[PDB]
Write a protein that binds this DNA or RNA. Structure first.
Length: 256
DNA sequence: GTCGTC
DNA sequence: ACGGGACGAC
């Protein structure tokens, strides 16, 4: 874990919530005929509400969510993941997605992305960017679009809240993030010709020919990511392994 | 709680 | 065919 110490700012664990400082706040273009839609918030049980509350509060403290009055409104859903009885906020942005202008999907499919890994580079590092979408600011003009209602019995919010960052459930988030990070890591690729860097939204794979080149490469990548404002999961990081898990594949001896 | 789909 | 009903997707 000497890496955790050498790169404080790069790990989600010690660098705090990220923010892509080099990326201009995103403006989300609407379809030519779109008009705001305000969907009714169906009553939520106290159990769900209590489970969600801490997440909402944390996001408010972090500034990711802010109060607002908007012509738009979509449902907030209480979702117990892994069948487990733990609730987390899930916004139904389907009506918003329908009204936002489409963009060409530029994220490669994992199968094709992996085809770009030579047998020569067998030293790997896998990094997962934490709260990736949240690292990208949303332009003030586009924020109203993702509003939802938030109710709390004692001293909280009085109406709607919305995101100041690219949100979950928005049809174009994966693509916009992949493109933004590609722009931010363009220079790194240029400064490290001998390194292979695969990008799949927030799932990164760095490939080197030698253990040391992977150590040096990994150090530089972590340094760059931290400086750019992104955060990698230290808990999940797979640093300089000749065998790693990436996008559902088990990379070993140049296999898969 | 909806809602598109195999 | 044509449509009630499981999956999972937001």
């Amino acid at each position: 874990m000497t890496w955790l110490s050498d790169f404080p700012q790069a790990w989600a664990e010690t660098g705090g919530m990220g923010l892509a400082v080099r990326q201009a706040p995103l403006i989300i273009p609407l379809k030519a005929t779109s008009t705001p839609v305000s969907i009714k918030q169906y009553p939520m049980s106290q159990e769900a509400r209590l489970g969600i509350k801490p997440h909402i509060q944390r996001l408010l403290d972090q500034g990711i969510l802010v109060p607002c009055q908007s012509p738009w409104n979509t449902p907030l859903l209480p979702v117990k993941k892994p069948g487990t009885n733990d609730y987390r906020p899930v916004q139904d942005l389907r009506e918003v997605n329908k009204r936002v202008e489409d963009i060409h999907p530029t994220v490669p499919n994992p199968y094709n992305l992996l085809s770009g890994l030579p047998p020569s580079h067998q030293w790997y590092t896998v990094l997962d960017l934490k709260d990736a979408f949240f690292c990208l600011r949303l332009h003030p003009t586009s924020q109203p679009l993702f509003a939802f209602e938030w109710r709390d019995p004692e001293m909280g919010i009085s109406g709607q809240l919305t995101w100041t960052r690219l949100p979950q459930g928005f049809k174009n988030s994966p693509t916009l993030f992949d493109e933004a990070l590609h722009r931010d890591l363009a220079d790194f690729r240029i400064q490290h010709p001998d390194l292979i860097l695969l990008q799949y939204v927030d799932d990164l794979l760095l490939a080197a020919t030698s253990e040391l080149d992977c150590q040096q490469g990994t150090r530089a990548l972590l340094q760059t990511l931290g400086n750019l404002g992104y955060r990698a999961s230290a808990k999940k990081a797979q640093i300089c392994q000749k065998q790693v898990k990436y996008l559902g594949y088990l990379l070993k001896e140049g296999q898969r």
